[PDB]
Amino acid sequence: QKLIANQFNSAIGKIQDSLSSTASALGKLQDVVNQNAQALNTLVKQLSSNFGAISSVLNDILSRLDPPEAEVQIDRLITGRLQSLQTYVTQQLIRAAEIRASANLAATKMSECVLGQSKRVDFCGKGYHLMSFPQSAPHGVVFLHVTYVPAQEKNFTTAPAICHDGKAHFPREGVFVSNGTHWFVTQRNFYEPQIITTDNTFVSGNCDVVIGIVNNTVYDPLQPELDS
Amino acid sequence: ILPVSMTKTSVDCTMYICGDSTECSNLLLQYGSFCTQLNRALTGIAVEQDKNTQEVFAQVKQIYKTPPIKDFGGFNFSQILPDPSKPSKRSFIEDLLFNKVTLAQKFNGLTVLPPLLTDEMIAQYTSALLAGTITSGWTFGAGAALQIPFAMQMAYRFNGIGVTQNVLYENQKLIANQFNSAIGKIQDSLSSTASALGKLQDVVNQNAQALNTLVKQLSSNFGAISSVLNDILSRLDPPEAEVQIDRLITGRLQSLQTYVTQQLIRAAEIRASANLAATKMSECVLGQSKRVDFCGKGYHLMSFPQSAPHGVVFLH
Amino acid sequence: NVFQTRAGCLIGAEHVNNSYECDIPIGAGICASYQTSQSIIAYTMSLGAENSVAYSNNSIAIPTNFTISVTTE
Ligand SMILES: *[C@@H]1O[C@H](CO)[C@@H](O[C@@H]2O[C@H](CO)[C@@H](O)[C@H](O)[C@H]2NC(C)=O)[C@H](O)[C@H]1NC(C)=O
Ligand SMILES: *[C@@H]1O[C@H](CO)[C@@H](O[C@@H]2O[C@H](CO)[C@@H](O)[C@H](O)[C@H]2NC(C)=O)[C@H](O)[C@H]1NC(C)=O
Ligand SMILES: *[C@@H]1O[C@H](CO)[C@@H](O[C@@H]2O[C@H](CO)[C@@H](O)[C@H](O)[C@H]2NC(C)=O)[C@H](O)[C@H]1NC(C)=O
Ligand SMILES: *[C@@H]1O[C@H](CO)[C@@H](O[C@@H]2O[C@H](CO)[C@@H](O)[C@H](O)[C@H]2NC(C)=O)[C@H](O)[C@H]1NC(C)=O
Ligand SMILES: *[C@@H]1O[C@H](CO)[C@@H](O)[C@H](O)[C@H]1NC(C)=O
Ligand SMILES: *[C@@H]1O[C@H](CO)[C@@H](O)[C@H](O)[C@H]1NC(C)=O
Ligand SMILES: *[C@@H]1O[C@H](CO)[C@@H](O)[C@H](O)[C@H]1NC(C)=O
């Protein structure tokens, strides 16, 4: 317990320091603001353009030219500005669709990886998922995925089954491992060897069908008690 | 089979509309900044095109490889493993896929940019994923790869779907024979039928049609005297040549806008498909899935990826 | 210092027979970087560190220790 608590606290401190020092981690949030501001500024700057007319300001045209062709010039100006507005609206629509697509995935992640524990591999972070915590951010959400990663390995010899009295014994859950001379049954994600016994294995037919089965004695907890 | 990326292309604006004309460039300058947003959008599309493949395939820290001696309890992976005999390190099924797909030449201001990753690196990525899956099982998706005999990995998979391992351990020969026969059958089916890769040919055909129509738009009068800019300039006087050129400018700009919008929509759809493919690769390949009909009909055991022109192919 | 790639022609950087992880993408599997000379190098992709698990038909590798990692999305 204490080791896991210390690891978790150290990880929290590390992510806090990483966020505090480096400022380039929030690209996925700054990009939206930059795109929106750039589009708005382009739309605003599109106002001052002749589009083929004499002047970019209609006030000069109306105060300097007769109506019969000032109307043609004004019409050209309206056509240009209307086309610009149409383009801006279309770009906004597409960007909003993309943001909705992102928001749906964000909602799914919040529903699954936060309100419960997910068994989807590589969906709530690398490794085996333990939990998640949410945090707010300007126009976005930030997830902290607490996961689980194995560290130090070993080498062992194995066997699919075991003969004890002509029968074949398979592990209830885990694997058979050997440290060179003895045999043990252990779980598949954390080395903890235990003595093989009938409480860890189950029988299935004779043992001349399995391939690569090596025979060793299987302890029985009933006989020592029954002797006395 | 599902697509993952489209052709990386980019079209210049000024050269396209009325390239090789100072007068028309001066006229177009009046239209504001219409000539830059299109280039920005196309560059964004190209960047996203590279990002799709980079995200889908690059999911391994290292590059694993199979041991030289192939002893997998009777399972035979020769049809999907990379073949050193071939000059390109691609398996037999990858070669079939590459040869089953057929088919930049115009230079009116449009160009195609090569992908960041050549097909050889994609093949190497798929080989690394396949070797990791075969040897380490699924534990290489979390931390360091841990070796495990293939028969025991299959026993773990059988225990995943609610069937005791003694079912597999007593039917190893039959299961191996069925798997080998299935691999042979799918190879033959891919090699025989011709319409097995529509989902990839359609994208190429659509992009080619769009580009061809965009180029063909050049030869439209759009209400002016003629579509030849040089003839209009050299036959009429500037006072009317200006108004004549204005119509061609407007029409060509409209065509370019329509093409750009179509490209944006198609790119969004392709991005959705690529995200789906990335999820499937991260779940069906790097592990066992309990979601029904997500990684194939029936109960799921494992998956093997392969590359294909602008796409990925799964074997469930 | 002229170099001819598949994606055009690059001048100002020298070719290198080595291979590293990409810092600036160029194309066709070619990237560039600023090593340390103090020049700009242009090289080929490096997908990752080579590895080969010592797979054997009766060998296993069981972890004996874990670590908790917190990742930000
Ligand atoms: C394999 O494991 C067994 C079980 O622990 C080891 O046998 C014991 O070893 C300890 C010392 O490590 C002795 O104190 C015990 O008396 C041994 N008990 C038995 C029943 O042998 C064995 O030494 C290990 N083998 C190797 C090569 O490490
Ligand atoms: C399991 O133990 C038995 C003996 O208890 C071994 O069976 C012997 O095998 C040899 C060679 O195959 C035969 O000549 C003997 O007749 C067998 N004896 C019996 C009683 O069956 C068997 O070899 C052991 N398992 C392994 C994998 O060696
Ligand atoms: C795996 O299957 C392939 C079939 O694609 C086997 O290769 C063939 O093997 C047969 C006899 O086993 C030969 O007659 C053919 O000429 C082989 N063809 C090719 C293209 O190699 C391969 O032998 C099988 N694997 C093992 C270990 O036998
Ligand atoms: C499992 O790994 C952890 C760290 O990854 C080990 O904890 C360290 O133990 C050493 C003593 O050998 C201490 O000096 C360190 O301070 C510990 N780390 C932390 C973060 O407290 C732990 O000992 C390992 N377990 C085993 C059985 O070796
Ligand atoms: C297990 O053995 C293989 C070959 O003997 C070796 O390459 C590997 O490093 C060993 N594993 C460990 C954790 O030492
Ligand atoms: C593993 O392969 C070797 C060949 O190098 C073979 O002798 C041995 O019998 C195999 N193991 C089993 C359990 O069959
Ligand atoms: C190493 O690079 C030099 C040029 O930098 C080149 O001439 C030489 O052929 C390269 N080495 C090999 C083995 O190709």
Side-chain angles (χ1 to χ4, degrees), chain A, chain B residues 1-60 62-105 107-316, chain C:
Chain A
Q1 207 178 335
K2 313 202 57 52
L3 161 70
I4 295 178
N6 292 353
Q7 296 194 34
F8 172 77
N9 303 349
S10 307
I12 281 295
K14 201 178 314 302
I15 166 62
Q16 185 259 20
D17 286 335
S18 155
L19 263 187
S20 175
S21 286
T22 309
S24 63
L26 305 202
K28 298 274 288 297
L29 264 46
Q30 194 82 20
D31 51 2
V32 158
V33 181
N34 282 343
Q35 277 167 334
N36 287 330
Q38 181 272 347
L40 208 67
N41 270 8
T42 291
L43 172 72
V44 158
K45 191 199 297 317
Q46 262 290 108
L47 262 180
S48 64
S49 292
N50 319 338
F51 294 85
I54 306 84
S55 165
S56 48
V57 51
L58 76 171
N59 201 76
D60 282 351
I61 301 300
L62 55 90
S63 66
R64 210 209 314 190
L65 264 55
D66 56 349
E69 45 89 9
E71 59 82 9
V72 170
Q73 308 320 284
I74 293 296
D75 156 80
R76 203 184 298 284
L77 270 193
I78 300 126
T79 45
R81 296 188 190 182
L82 208 50
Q83 169 150 347
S84 158
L85 202 40
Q86 285 319 125
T87 286
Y88 161 78
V89 165
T90 286
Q91 309 295 70
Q92 269 302 284
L93 265 182
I94 278 163
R95 196 156 312 137
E98 215 77 4
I99 294 301
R100 162 176 48 77
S102 167
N104 280 340
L105 172 56
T108 289
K109 261 174 186 261
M110 161 75 78
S111 161
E112 298 186 1
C113 315
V114 183
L115 277 81
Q117 157 159 357
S118 162
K119 290 197 53 51
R120 319 182 61 202
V121 51
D122 210 318
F123 181 72
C124 320
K126 286 266 313 182
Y128 306 109
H129 172 262
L130 271 197
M131 51 185 108
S132 283
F133 305 121
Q135 294 297 340
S136 48
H139 299 162
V141 73
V142 172
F143 285 118
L144 311 183
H145 299 324
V146 180
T147 62
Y148 170 97
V149 169
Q152 311 172 356
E153 295 80 346
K154 281 290 285 300
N155 265 340
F156 298 106
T157 48
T158 48
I162 275 181
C163 301
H164 180 31
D165 275 330
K167 299 161 314 188
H169 298 49
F170 302 75
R172 204 153 266 155
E173 161 268 354
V175 281
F176 289 134
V177 293
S178 168
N179 69 328
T181 75
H182 301 77
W183 282 102
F184 293 122
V185 50
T186 198
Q187 55 189 171
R188 311 154 166 180
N189 280 326
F190 194 84
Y191 184 67
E192 45 157 359
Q194 328 186 253
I195 303 291
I196 325 170
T197 169
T198 52
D199 316 330
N200 315 328
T201 76
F202 67 94
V203 190
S204 160
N206 59 349
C207 72
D208 59 348
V209 188
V210 197
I211 296 186
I213 166 172
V214 46
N215 54 41
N216 186 0
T217 173
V218 165
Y219 169 81
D220 202 350
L222 182 56
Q223 294 323 110
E225 184 52 84
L226 282 195
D227 284 338
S228 174
Chain B
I1 301 170
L2 67 165
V4 79
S5 89
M6 68 190 340
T7 311
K8 193 133 87 97
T9 175
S10 158
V11 182
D12 180 18
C13 187
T14 294
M15 178 148 20
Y16 165 64
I17 298 176
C18 47
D20 161 4
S21 170
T22 165
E23 320 85 357
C24 187
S25 61
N26 288 312
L27 292 181
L28 181 55
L29 172 43
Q30 304 292 313
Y31 280 57
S33 68
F34 276 10
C35 318
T36 82
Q37 308 108 20
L38 319 180
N39 287 321
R40 183 177 291 111
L42 286 175
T43 51
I45 271 176
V47 167
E48 156 285 328
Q49 282 309 285
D50 267 332
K51 172 59 162 326
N52 275 352
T53 284
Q54 199 277 333
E55 173 174 50
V56 158
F57 280 104
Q59 257 153 338
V60 286
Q62 329 199 50
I63 296 297
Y64 309 94
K65 66 171 183 58
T66 167
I69 297 170
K70 313 286 194 279
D71 192 8
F72 300 125
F75 301 90
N76 182 7
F77 297 112
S78 85
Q79 293 291 95
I80 56 185
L81 277 174
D83 209 325
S85 72
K86 214 261 182 185
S88 177
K89 293 311 176 285
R90 286 186 319 218
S91 168
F92 194 94
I93 291 184
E94 277 152 313
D95 277 343
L96 269 188
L97 293 183
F98 265 74
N99 291 346
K100 281 289 288 324
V101 179
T102 60
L103 191 137
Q105 43 199 357
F107 292 114
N108 284 359
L110 51 99
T111 36
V112 292
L113 321 176
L116 178 56
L117 301 92
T118 44
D119 54 13
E120 299 310 317
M121 310 200 208
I122 313 296
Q124 268 192 67
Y125 266 142
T126 65
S127 155
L129 278 156
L130 204 146
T133 286
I134 275 184
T135 67
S136 59
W138 66 65
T139 182
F140 86 97
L146 321 179
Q147 70 250 59
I148 169 160
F150 196 61
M152 281 205 268
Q153 181 195 165
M154 201 46 59
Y156 283 11
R157 309 256 171 162
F158 265 33
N159 205 152
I161 71 177
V163 177
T164 50
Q165 27 193 326
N166 57 3
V167 160
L168 157 74
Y169 277 143
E170 308 166 346
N171 302 63
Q172 214 163 332
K173 277 215 191 50
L174 181 60
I175 294 195
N177 278 1
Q178 296 194 35
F179 176 42
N180 304 356
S181 294
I183 284 291
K185 207 179 312 298
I186 178 47
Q187 180 263 13
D188 267 347
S189 169
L190 258 187
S191 172
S192 304
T193 318
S195 45
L197 267 78
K199 292 190 59 45
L200 304 180
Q201 209 86 21
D202 51 7
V203 158
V204 181
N205 288 357
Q206 284 182 358
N207 291 173
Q209 275 301 117
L211 257 293
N212 201 298
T213 290
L214 176 56
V215 158
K216 187 66 63 61
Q217 282 286 102
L218 267 294
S219 317
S220 283
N221 303 347
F222 284 99
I225 294 303
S226 173
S227 75
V228 187
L229 197 96
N230 286 300
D231 166 89
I232 298 307
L233 259 302
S234 81
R235 211 266 313 289
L236 293 195
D237 315 332
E240 76 270 21
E242 185 273 346
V243 63
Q244 288 295 292
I245 292 324
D246 196 55
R247 302 164 73 77
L248 253 63
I249 284 179
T250 302
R252 286 170 178 190
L253 197 139
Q254 174 79 1
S255 283
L256 193 48
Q257 196 63 36
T258 293
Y259 162 83
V260 167
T261 291
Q262 295 297 334
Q263 280 325 102
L264 264 182
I265 279 164
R266 191 163 304 117
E269 142 174 350
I270 272 296
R271 168 143 197 73
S273 163
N275 262 354
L276 166 66
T279 296
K280 258 175 187 265
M281 163 94 51
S282 275
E283 289 177 17
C284 308
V285 166
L286 261 67
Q288 196 190 26
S289 165
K290 311 287 192 323
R291 312 173 57 195
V292 199
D293 279 26
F294 190 33
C295 317
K297 299 287 182 289
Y299 301 104
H300 173 230
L301 280 193
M302 49 179 21
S303 296
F304 302 121
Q306 312 281 266
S307 72
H310 297 326
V312 69
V313 160
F314 287 89
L315 304 190
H316 302 304
Chain C
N1 293 340
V2 181
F3 186 53
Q4 162 74 87
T5 82
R6 193 48 62 189
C9 179
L10 167 138
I11 55 193
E14 55 168 352
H15 199 42
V16 175
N17 297 333
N18 295 358
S19 47
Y20 320 80
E21 74 284 17
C22 191
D23 201 358
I24 307 176
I26 283 66
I30 308 299
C31 291
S33 174
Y34 183 69
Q35 53 88 1
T36 50
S37 313
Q38 305 294 325
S39 58
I40 288 193
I41 52 182
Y43 49 70
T44 298
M45 254 305 168
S46 88
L47 314 166
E50 186 93 23
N51 189 355
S52 66
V53 280
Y55 167 65
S56 192
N57 56 13
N58 60 354
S59 156
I60 205 85
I62 282 177
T64 88
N65 201 339
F66 53 85
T67 177
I68 319 294
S69 89
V70 170
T71 306
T72 280
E73 183 34 280

